[PDB]
Amino acid sequence: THINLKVSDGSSEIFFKIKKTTPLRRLMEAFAKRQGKEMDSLRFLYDGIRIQADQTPEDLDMEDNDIIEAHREQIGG
């Protein structure tokens, strides 16, 4: 019921411990804060596809230790 996710860009890896039913918004906020960045400026990707903030680990079938890539959001387009 509580999977453990690793979020990372190029230079920084963090571990969040969230509940399978908690929407992923909480975690994207938390990773973007710990970088003094805004959540809109970062693009979170799981196993290829771009995570939507409203989606939950349950929805995406995230097992323990799965990796969320964070990339910068380009302004165009």
Give residues in contact with Ba ion (CB under 5 A): 61, 63, 66
Cα 77 to Cα 74: distance, rounded to the nearest angstrom: 7
Question: 33: part of which helix (H) or strand (E)?
Answer: helix 25-33
User: Shortest approach of Ba ion to residue 34 CB, angstroms?
Assistant: 22
State the first-to-last Cα distance of the chain, in angstroms, to the nearest integer.
Answer: 38
Cα 23 to Cα 74: distance, rounded to the nearest angstrom: 24
Q: Residue 65 is encoded by which pair of tokens?
A: 């230790």
User: Shortest approach of Ba ion to residue 40 CB, angstroms?
Assistant: 6
Of the two residues 38 and 61, which places its CB atom closer to Ba ion in the complex?
61
Of the two residues 5 and 31, which places its CB atom closer to Ba ion in the complex?
5
User: Shortest approach of Ba ion to residue 19 CB, angstroms?
Assistant: 17
Of the two residues 66 and 69, which places its CB atom closer to Ba ion in the complex?
66
